[PDB]
mmCIF file of N, CA and C and ligand atoms in Angstrom:
data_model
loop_
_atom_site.group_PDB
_atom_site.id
_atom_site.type_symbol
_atom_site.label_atom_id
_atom_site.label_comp_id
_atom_site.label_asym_id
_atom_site.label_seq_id
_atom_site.Cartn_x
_atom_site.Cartn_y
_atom_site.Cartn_z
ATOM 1 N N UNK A 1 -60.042 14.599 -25.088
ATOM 2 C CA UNK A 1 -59.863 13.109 -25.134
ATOM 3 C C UNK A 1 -58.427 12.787 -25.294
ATOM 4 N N UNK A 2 -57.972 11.796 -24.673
ATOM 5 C CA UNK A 2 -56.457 11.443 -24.480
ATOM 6 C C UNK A 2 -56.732 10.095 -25.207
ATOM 7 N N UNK A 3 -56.554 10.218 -26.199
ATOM 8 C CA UNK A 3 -56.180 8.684 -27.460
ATOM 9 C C UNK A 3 -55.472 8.081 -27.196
ATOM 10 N N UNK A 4 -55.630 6.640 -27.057
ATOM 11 C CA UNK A 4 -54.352 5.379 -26.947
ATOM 12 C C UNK A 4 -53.670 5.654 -27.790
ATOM 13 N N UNK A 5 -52.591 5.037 -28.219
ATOM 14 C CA UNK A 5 -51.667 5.135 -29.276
ATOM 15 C C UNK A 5 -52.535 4.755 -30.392
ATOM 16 N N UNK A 6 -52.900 3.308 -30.833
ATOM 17 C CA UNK A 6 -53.429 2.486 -31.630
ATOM 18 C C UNK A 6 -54.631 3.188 -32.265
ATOM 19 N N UNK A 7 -55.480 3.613 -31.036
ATOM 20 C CA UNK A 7 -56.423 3.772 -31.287
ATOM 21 C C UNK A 7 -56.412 5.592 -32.089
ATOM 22 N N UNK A 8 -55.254 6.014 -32.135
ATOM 23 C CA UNK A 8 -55.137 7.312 -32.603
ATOM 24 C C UNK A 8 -54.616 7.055 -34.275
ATOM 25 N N UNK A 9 -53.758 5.938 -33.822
ATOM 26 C CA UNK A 9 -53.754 5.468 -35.621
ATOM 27 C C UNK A 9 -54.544 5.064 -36.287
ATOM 28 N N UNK A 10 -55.793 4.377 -35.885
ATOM 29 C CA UNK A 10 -56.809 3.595 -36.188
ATOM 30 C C UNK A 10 -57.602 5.100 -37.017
ATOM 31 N N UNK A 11 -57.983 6.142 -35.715
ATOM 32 C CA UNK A 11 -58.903 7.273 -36.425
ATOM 33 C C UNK A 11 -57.796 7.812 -37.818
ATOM 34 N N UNK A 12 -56.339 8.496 -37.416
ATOM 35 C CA UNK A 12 -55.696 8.950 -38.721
ATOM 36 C C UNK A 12 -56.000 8.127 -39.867
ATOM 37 N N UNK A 13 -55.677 6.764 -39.575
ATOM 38 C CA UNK A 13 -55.950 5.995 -41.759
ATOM 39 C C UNK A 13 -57.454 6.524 -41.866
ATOM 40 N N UNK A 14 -58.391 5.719 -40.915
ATOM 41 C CA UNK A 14 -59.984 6.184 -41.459
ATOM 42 C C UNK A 14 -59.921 7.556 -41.661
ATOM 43 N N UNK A 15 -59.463 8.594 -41.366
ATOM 44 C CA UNK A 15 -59.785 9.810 -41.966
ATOM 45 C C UNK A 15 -58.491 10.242 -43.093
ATOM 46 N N UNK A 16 -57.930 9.039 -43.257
ATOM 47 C CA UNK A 16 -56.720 9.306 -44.935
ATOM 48 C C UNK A 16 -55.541 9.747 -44.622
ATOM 49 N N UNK A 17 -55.391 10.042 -43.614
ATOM 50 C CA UNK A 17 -53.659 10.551 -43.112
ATOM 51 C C UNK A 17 -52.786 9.119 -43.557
ATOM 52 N N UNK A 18 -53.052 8.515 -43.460
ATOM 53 C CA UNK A 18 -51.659 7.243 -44.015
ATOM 54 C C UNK A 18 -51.151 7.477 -45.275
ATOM 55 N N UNK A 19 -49.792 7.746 -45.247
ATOM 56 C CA UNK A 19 -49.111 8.429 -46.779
ATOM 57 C C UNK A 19 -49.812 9.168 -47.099
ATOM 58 N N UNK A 20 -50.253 10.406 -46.451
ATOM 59 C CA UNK A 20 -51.129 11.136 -47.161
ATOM 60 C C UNK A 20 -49.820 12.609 -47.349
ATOM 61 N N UNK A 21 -49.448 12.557 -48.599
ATOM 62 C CA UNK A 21 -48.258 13.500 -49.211
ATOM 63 C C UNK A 21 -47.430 12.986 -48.969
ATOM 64 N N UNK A 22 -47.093 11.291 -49.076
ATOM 65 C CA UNK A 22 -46.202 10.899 -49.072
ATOM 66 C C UNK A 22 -45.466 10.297 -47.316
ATOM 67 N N UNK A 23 -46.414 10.771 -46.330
ATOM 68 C CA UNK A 23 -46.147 10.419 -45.047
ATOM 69 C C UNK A 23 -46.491 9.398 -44.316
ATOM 70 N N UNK A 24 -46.316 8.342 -43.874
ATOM 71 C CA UNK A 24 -46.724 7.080 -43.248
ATOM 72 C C UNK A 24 -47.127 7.298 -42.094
ATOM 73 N N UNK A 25 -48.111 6.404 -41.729
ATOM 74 C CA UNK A 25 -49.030 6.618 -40.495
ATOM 75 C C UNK A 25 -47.946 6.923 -39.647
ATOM 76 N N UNK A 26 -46.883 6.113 -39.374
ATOM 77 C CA UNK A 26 -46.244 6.238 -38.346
ATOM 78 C C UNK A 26 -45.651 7.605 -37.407
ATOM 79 N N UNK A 27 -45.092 8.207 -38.972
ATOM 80 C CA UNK A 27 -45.174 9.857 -38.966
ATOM 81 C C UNK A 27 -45.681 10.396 -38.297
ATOM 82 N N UNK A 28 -47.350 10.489 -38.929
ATOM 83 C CA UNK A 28 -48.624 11.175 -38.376
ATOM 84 C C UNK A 28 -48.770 10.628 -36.356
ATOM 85 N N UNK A 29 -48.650 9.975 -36.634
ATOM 86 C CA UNK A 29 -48.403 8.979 -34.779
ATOM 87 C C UNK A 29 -47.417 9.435 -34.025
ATOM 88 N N UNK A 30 -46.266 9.478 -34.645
ATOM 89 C CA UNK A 30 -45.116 10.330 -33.596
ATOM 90 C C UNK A 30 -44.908 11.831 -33.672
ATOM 91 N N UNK A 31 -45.876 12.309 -34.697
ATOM 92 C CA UNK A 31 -46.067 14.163 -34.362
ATOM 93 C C UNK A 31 -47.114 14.150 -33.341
ATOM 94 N N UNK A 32 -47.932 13.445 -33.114
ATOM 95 C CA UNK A 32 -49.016 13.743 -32.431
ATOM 96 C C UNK A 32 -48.638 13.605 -30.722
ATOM 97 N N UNK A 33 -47.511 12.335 -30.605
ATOM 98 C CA UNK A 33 -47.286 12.348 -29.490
ATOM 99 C C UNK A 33 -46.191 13.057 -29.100
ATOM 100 N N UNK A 34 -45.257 13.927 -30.019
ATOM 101 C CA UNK A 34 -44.581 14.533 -29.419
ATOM 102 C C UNK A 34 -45.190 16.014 -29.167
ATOM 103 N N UNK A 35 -46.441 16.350 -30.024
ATOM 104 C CA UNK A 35 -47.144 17.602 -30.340
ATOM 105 C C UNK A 35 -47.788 17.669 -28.916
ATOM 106 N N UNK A 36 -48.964 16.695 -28.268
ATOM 107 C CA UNK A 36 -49.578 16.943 -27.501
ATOM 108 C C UNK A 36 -49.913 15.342 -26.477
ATOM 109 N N UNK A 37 -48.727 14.601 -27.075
ATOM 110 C CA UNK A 37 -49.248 13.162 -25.723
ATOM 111 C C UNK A 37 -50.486 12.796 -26.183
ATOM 112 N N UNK A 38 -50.966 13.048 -27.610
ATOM 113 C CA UNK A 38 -52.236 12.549 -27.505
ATOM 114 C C UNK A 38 -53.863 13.300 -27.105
ATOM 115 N N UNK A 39 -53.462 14.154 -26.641
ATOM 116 C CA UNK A 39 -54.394 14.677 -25.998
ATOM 117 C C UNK A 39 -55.347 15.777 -26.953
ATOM 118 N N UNK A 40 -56.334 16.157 -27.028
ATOM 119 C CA UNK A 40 -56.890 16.435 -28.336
ATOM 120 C C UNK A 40 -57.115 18.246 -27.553
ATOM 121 N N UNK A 41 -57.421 18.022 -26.375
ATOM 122 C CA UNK A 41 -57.272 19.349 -25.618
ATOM 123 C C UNK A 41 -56.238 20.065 -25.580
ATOM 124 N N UNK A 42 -54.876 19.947 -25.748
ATOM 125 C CA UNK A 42 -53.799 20.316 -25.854
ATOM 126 C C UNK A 42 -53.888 22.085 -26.497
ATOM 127 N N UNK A 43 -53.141 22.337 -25.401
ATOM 128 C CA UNK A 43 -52.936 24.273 -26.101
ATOM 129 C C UNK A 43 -51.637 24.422 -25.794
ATOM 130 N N UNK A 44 -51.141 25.278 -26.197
ATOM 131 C CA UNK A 44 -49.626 26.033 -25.938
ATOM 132 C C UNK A 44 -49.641 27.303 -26.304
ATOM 133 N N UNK A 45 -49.308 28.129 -25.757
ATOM 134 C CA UNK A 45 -48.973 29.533 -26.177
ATOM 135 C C UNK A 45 -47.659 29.689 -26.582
ATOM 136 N N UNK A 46 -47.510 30.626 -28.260
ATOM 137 C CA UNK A 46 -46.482 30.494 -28.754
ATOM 138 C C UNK A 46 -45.782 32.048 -28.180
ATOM 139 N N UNK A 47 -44.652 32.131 -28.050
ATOM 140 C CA UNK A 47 -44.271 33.533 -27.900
ATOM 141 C C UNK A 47 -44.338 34.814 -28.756
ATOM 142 N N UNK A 48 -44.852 34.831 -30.240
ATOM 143 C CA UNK A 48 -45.226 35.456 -31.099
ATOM 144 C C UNK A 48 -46.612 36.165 -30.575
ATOM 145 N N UNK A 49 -47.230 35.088 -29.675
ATOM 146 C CA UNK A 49 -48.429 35.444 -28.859
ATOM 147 C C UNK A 49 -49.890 34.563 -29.806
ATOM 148 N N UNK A 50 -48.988 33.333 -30.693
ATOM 149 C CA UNK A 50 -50.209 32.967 -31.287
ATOM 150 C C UNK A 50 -50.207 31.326 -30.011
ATOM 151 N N UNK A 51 -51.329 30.763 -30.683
ATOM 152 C CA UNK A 51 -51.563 29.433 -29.601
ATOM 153 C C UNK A 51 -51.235 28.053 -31.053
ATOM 154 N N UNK A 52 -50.840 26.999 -30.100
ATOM 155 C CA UNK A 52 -50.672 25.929 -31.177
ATOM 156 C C UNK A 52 -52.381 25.083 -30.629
ATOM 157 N N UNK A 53 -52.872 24.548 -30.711
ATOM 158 C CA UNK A 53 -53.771 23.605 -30.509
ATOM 159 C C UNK A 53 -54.518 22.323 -30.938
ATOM 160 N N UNK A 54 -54.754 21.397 -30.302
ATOM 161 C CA UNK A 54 -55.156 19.846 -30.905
ATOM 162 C C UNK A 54 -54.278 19.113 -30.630
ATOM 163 N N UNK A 55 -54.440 17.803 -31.422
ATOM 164 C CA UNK A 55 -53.371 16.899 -31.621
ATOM 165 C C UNK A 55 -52.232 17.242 -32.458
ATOM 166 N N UNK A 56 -52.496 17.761 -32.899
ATOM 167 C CA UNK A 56 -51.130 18.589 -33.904
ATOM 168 C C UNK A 56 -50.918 19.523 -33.573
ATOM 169 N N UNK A 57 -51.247 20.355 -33.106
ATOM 170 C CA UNK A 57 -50.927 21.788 -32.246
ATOM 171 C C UNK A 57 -50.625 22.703 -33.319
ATOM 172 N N UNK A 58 -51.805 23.256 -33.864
ATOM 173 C CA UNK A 58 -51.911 23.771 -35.233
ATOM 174 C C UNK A 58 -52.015 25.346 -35.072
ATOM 175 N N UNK A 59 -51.025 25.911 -35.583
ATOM 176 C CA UNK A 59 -51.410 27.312 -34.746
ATOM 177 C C UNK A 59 -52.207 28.455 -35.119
ATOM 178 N N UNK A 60 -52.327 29.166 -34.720
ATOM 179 C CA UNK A 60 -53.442 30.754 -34.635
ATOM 180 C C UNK A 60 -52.754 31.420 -35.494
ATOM 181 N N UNK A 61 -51.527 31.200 -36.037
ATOM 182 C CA UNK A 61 -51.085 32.058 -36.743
ATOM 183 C C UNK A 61 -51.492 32.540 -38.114
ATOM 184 N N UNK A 62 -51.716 31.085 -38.898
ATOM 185 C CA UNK A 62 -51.954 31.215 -39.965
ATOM 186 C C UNK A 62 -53.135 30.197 -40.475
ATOM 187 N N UNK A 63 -53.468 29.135 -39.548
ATOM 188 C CA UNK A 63 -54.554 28.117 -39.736
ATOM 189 C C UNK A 63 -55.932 28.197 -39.318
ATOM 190 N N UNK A 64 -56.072 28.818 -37.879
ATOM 191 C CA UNK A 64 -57.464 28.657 -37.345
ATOM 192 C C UNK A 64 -57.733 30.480 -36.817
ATOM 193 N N UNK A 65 -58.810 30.501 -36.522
ATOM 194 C CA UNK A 65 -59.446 31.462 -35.827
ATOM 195 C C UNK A 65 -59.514 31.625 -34.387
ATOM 196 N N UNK A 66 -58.933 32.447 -33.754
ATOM 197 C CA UNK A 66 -59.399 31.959 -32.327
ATOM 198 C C UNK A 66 -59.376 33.379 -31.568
ATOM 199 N N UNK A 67 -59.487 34.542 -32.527
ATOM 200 C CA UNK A 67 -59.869 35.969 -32.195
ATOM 201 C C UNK A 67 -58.735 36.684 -31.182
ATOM 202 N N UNK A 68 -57.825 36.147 -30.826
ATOM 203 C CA UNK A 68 -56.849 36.597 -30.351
ATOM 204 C C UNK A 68 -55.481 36.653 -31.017
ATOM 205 N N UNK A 69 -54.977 36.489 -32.589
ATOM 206 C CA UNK A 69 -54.203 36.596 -32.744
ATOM 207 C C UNK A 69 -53.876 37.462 -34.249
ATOM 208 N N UNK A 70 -53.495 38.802 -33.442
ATOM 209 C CA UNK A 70 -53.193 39.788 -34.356
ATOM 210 C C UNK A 70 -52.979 39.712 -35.687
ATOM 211 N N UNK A 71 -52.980 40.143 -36.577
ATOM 212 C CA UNK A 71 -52.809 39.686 -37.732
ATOM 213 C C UNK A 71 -52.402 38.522 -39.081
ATOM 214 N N UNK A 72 -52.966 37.615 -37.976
ATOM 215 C CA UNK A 72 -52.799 36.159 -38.124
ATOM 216 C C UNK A 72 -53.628 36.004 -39.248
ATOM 217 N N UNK A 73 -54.076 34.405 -40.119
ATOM 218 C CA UNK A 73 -54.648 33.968 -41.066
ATOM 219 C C UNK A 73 -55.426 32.862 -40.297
ATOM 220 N N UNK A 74 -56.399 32.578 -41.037
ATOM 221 C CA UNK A 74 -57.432 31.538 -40.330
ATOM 222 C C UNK A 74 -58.044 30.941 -41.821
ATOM 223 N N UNK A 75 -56.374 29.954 -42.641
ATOM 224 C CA UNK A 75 -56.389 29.257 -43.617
ATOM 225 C C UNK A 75 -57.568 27.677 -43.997
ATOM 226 N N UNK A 76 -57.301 27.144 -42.704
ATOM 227 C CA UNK A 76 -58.272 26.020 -42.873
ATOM 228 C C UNK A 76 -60.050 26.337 -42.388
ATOM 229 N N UNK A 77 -59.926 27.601 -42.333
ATOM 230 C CA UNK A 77 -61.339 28.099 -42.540
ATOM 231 C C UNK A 77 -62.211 27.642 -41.165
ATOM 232 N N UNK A 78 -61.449 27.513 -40.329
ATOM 233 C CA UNK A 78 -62.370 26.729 -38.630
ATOM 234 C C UNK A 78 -61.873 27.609 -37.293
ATOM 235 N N UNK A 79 -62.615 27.913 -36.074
ATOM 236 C CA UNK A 79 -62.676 28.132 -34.975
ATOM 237 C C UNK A 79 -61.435 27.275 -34.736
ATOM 238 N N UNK A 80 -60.232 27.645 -33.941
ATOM 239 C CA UNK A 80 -59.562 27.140 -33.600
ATOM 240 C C UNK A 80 -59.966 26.132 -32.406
ATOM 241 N N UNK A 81 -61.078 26.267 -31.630
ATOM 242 C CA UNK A 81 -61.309 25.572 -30.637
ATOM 243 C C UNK A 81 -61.966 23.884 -31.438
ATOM 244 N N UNK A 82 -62.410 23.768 -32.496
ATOM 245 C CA UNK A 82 -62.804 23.076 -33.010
ATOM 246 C C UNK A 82 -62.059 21.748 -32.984
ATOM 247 N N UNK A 83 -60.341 22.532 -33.327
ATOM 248 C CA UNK A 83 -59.322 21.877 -32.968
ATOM 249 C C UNK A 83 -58.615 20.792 -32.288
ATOM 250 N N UNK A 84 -59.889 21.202 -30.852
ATOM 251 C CA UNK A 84 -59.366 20.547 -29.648
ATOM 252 C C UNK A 84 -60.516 19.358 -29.437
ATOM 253 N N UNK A 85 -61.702 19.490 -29.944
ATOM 254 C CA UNK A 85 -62.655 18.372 -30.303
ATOM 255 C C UNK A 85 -62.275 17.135 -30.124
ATOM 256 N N UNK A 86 -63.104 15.615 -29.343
ATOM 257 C CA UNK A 86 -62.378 14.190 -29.484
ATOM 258 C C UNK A 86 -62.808 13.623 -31.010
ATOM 259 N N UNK A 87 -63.473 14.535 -31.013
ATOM 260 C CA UNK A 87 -63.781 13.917 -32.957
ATOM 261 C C UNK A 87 -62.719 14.811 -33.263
ATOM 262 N N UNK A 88 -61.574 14.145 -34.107
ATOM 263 C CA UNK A 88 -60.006 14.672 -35.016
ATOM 264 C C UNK A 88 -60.467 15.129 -36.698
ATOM 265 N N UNK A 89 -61.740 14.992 -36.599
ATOM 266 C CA UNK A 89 -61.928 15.211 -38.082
ATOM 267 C C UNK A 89 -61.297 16.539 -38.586
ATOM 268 N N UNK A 90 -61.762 17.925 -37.752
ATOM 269 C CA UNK A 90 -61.129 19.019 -37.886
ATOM 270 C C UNK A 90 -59.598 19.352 -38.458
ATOM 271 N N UNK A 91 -58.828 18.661 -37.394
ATOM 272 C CA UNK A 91 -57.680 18.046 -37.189
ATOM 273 C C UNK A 91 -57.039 17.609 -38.460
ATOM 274 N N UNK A 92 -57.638 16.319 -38.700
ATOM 275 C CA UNK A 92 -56.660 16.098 -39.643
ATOM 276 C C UNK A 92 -57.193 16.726 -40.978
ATOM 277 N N UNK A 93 -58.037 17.266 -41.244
ATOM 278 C CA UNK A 93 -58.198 18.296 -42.436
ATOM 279 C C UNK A 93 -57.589 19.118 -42.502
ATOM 280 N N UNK A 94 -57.706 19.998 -41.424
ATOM 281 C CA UNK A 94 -56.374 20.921 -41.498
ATOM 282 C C UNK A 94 -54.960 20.438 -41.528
ATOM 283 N N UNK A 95 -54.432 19.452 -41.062
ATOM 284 C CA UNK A 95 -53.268 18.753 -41.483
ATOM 285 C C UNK A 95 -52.846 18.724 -42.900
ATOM 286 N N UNK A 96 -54.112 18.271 -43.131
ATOM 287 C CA UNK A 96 -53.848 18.361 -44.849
ATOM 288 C C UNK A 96 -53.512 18.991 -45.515
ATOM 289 N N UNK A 97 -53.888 20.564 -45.049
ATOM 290 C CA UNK A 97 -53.278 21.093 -45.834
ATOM 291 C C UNK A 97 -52.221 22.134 -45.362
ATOM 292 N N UNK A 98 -52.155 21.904 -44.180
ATOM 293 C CA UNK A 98 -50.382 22.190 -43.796
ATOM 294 C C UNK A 98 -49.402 21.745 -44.237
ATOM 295 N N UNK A 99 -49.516 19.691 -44.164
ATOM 296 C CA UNK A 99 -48.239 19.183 -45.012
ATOM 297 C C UNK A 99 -48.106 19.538 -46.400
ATOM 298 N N UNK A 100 -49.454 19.707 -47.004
ATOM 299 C CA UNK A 100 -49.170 20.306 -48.567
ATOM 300 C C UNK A 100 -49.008 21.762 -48.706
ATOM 301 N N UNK A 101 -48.343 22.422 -48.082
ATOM 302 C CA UNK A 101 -47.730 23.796 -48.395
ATOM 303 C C UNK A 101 -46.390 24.169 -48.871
ATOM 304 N N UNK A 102 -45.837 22.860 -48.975
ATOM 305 C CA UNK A 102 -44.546 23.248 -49.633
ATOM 306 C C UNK A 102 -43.186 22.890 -48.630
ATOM 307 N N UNK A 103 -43.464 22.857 -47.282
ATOM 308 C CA UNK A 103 -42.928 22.031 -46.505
ATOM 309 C C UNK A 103 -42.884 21.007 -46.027
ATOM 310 N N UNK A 104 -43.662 20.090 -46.237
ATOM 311 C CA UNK A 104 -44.429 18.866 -45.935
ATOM 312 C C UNK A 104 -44.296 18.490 -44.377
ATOM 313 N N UNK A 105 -43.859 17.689 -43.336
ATOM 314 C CA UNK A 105 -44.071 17.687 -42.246
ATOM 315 C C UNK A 105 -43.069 18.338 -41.454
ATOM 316 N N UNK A 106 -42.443 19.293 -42.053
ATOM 317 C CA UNK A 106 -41.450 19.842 -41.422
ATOM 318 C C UNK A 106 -42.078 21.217 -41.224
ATOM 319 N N UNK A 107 -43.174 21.565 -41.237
ATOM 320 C CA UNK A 107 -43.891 22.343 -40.873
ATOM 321 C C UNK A 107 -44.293 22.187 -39.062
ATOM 322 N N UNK A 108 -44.264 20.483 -38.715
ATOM 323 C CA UNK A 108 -44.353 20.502 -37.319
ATOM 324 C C UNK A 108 -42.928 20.311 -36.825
ATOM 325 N N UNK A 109 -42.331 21.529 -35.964
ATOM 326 C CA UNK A 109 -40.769 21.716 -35.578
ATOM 327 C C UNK A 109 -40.524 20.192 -34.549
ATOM 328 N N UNK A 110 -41.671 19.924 -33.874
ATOM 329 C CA UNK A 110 -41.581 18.496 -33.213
ATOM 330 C C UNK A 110 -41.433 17.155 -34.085
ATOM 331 N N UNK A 111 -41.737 17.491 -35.026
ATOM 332 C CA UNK A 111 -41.562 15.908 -36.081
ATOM 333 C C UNK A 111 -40.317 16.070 -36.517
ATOM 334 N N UNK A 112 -39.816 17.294 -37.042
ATOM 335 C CA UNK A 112 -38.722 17.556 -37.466
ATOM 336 C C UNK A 112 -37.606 17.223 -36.836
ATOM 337 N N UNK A 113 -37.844 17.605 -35.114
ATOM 338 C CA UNK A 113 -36.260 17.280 -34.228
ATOM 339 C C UNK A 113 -36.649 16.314 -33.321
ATOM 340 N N UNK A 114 -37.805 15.547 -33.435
ATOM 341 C CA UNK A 114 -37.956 14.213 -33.055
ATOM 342 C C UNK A 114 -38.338 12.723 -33.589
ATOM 343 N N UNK A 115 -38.998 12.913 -34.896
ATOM 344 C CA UNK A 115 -39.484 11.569 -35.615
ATOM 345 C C UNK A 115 -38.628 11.786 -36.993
ATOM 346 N N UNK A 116 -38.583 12.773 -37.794
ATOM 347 C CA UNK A 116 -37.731 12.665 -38.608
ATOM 348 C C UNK A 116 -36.505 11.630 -38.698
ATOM 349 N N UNK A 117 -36.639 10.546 -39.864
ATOM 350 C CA UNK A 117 -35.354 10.250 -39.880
ATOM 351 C C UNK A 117 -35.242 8.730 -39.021
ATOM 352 N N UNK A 118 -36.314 8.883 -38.128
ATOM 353 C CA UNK A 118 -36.264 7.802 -36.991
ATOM 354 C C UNK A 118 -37.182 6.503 -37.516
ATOM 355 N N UNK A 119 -37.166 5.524 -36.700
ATOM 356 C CA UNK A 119 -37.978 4.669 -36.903
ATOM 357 C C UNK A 119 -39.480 4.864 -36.706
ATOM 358 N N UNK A 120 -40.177 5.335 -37.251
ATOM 359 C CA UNK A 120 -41.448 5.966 -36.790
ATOM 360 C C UNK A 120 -42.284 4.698 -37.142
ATOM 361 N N UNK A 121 -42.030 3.796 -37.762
ATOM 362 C CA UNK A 121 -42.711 2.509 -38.098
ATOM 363 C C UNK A 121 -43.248 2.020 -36.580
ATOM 364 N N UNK A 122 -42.427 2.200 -35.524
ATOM 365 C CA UNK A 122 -42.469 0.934 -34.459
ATOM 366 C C UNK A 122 -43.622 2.243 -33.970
ATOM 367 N N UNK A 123 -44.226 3.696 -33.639
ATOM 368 C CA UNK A 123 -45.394 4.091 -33.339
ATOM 369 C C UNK A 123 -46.764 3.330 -33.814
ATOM 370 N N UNK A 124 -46.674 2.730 -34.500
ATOM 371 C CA UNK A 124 -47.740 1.884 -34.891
ATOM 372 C C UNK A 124 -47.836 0.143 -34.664
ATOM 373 N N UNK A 125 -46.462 -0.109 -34.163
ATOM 374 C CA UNK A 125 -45.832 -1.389 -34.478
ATOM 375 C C UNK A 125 -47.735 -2.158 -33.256
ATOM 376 N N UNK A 126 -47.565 -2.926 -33.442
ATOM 377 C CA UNK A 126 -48.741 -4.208 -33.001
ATOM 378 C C UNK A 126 -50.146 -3.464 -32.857
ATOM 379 N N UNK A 127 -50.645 -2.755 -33.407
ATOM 380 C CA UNK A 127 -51.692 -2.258 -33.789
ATOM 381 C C UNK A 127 -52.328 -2.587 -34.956
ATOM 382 N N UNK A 128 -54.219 -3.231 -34.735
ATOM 383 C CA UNK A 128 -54.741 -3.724 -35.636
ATOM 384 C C UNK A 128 -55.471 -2.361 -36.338
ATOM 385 N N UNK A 129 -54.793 -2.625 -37.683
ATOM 386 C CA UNK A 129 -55.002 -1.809 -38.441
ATOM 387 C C UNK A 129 -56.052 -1.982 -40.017
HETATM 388 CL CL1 CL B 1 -57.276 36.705 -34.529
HETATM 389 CL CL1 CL B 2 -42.518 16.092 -48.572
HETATM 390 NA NA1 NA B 3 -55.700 33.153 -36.932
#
């Protein structure tokens, strides 16, 4: 499923991502579109040989399961394909507890060298919320 903008902020608050560790929806809105355009199908292969996947592009390394990645961790306890689901529930659970590891959203290298710092307010700007 390829989420409108709005309508991708709309699911993040209902499932608690707004300031959730301190991060504003807007945040959560401009990782997602720089992570995957939205798109909940979204994969990437990392060169380590793990995969990122979802709207957050959450990787095989240390978060999900997806039986192909060598001595990886499968922390948020789910099938990585689960990931890619148009229901985000998966998604942003595991989010959760990525930003709370001690890095907070600088754990996604795309928020970091693209929304960081920026106006991330206007990703949400005229959306009924
Ligand atoms: Cl594996
Ligand atoms: Cl933080
Ligand atoms: Na894994």
């Amino acid at each position: 499923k390829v989420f409108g903008r709005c309508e991708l902020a709309a699911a993040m608050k209902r499932h608690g991502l707004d300031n959730y560790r301190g991060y504003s929806l807007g945040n959560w809105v401009c990782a997602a579109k720089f992570e995957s355009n939205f798109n909940t199908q979204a994969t990437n292969r990392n060169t380590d040989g793990s995969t990122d996947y979802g709207i957050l592009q959450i990787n095989s390394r240390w978060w999900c399961n997806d039986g192909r990645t060598p001595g990886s961790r499968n922390l948020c306890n789910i099938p990585c394909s689960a990931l890619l689901s148009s229901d985000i529930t998966a998604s942003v659970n595991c989010a959760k507890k990525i930003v709370s590891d001690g890095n907070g959203m600088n754990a996604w290298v795309a928020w970091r060298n693209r929304c960081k710092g920026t106006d991330v307010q206007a990703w949400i700007r005229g959306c009924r919320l």
